[PDB]
Amino acid sequence: AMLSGKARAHTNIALIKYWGKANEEYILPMNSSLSLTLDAFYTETTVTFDAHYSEDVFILNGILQNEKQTKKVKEFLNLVRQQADCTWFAKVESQNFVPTAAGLASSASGLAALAGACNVALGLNLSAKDLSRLARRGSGSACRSIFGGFAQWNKGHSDETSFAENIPANNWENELAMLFILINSSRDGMKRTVETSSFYQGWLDNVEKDLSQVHEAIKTKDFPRLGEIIEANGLRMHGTTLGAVPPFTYWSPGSLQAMALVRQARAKGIPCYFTMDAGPNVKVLVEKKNLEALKTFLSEHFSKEQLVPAFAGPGIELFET
């Protein structure tokens, strides 16, 4: 009396940022967002539901997780169980394929993979749209990792209408790369910013414009246009935290050094553009045909261990056990 499933999902990096929840219970976002799914970083997850299990168990990278590290997995297991009318405890075993001791966020790839594995194990037979809706309830950004390449999370207005979809780009994403500069809370800083920042309305008033321009850059394969929009959108998101009460920044000293070096690279004719999420690492969007020039430039202040490249990656892969 057991049911099991497995999935692999890749990480994605938001170009137009997800930033603020309109509804916390269902993770419906204040604004739509757009990401690129990456080949380099991913999660592999298996889940087992078994009548003989006596409690929910989460093992990550071979290590038993404690109640605090298991809280998000357990809330996702509870809602997929309630939706199946399933009364069994589960065991989740996951491995994050990311750089060791690097601060990469694996909630996108982790929750997407778990959603896919549960979909298989419980035989939910979800379409890609409904699987994205399910993954959305685990982690907002996970709903975009259902898809490969460019993907947009439409904010919708309800559980039924908030979900992601691939953005056809006539394979332009296979000409692009992202270089991660590894530099020595997301959900709480976001909530504080939505509820208290004098700058948050300025964030909202500019997202739709940014999304339209990204769509137009994609349709014309205009890399400098794309890069300018996404770099400014990321800086706008980080500006909002300085208007929160109390104010805060996600940046570290090394973040600013990296951002400054990207601007210098661009001054020397290397078209590249940075973005940051809720932490200090700096991701650099660059065309493949320019990636080695960019790595050559940043060698002077960063070891090779700090420069990890990534390319466009596929949507979720589901596996029967």
Ligand SMILES: Nc1ncnc2c1ncn2[C@@H]1O[C@H](COP(=O)(O)OP(=O)(O)OP(=O)(O)O)[C@@H](O)[C@H]1O
């Ligand atoms: N492979 C995985 N499978 C399931 N859950 C995972 C996996 N990897 C991480 N998680 C869970 O997702 C959480 C996300 O943490 P992470 O630092 O990677 O991203 P985040 O967006 O900054 O989230 P948070 O603010 O909750 O820490 C982890 O603390 C863990 O509980």
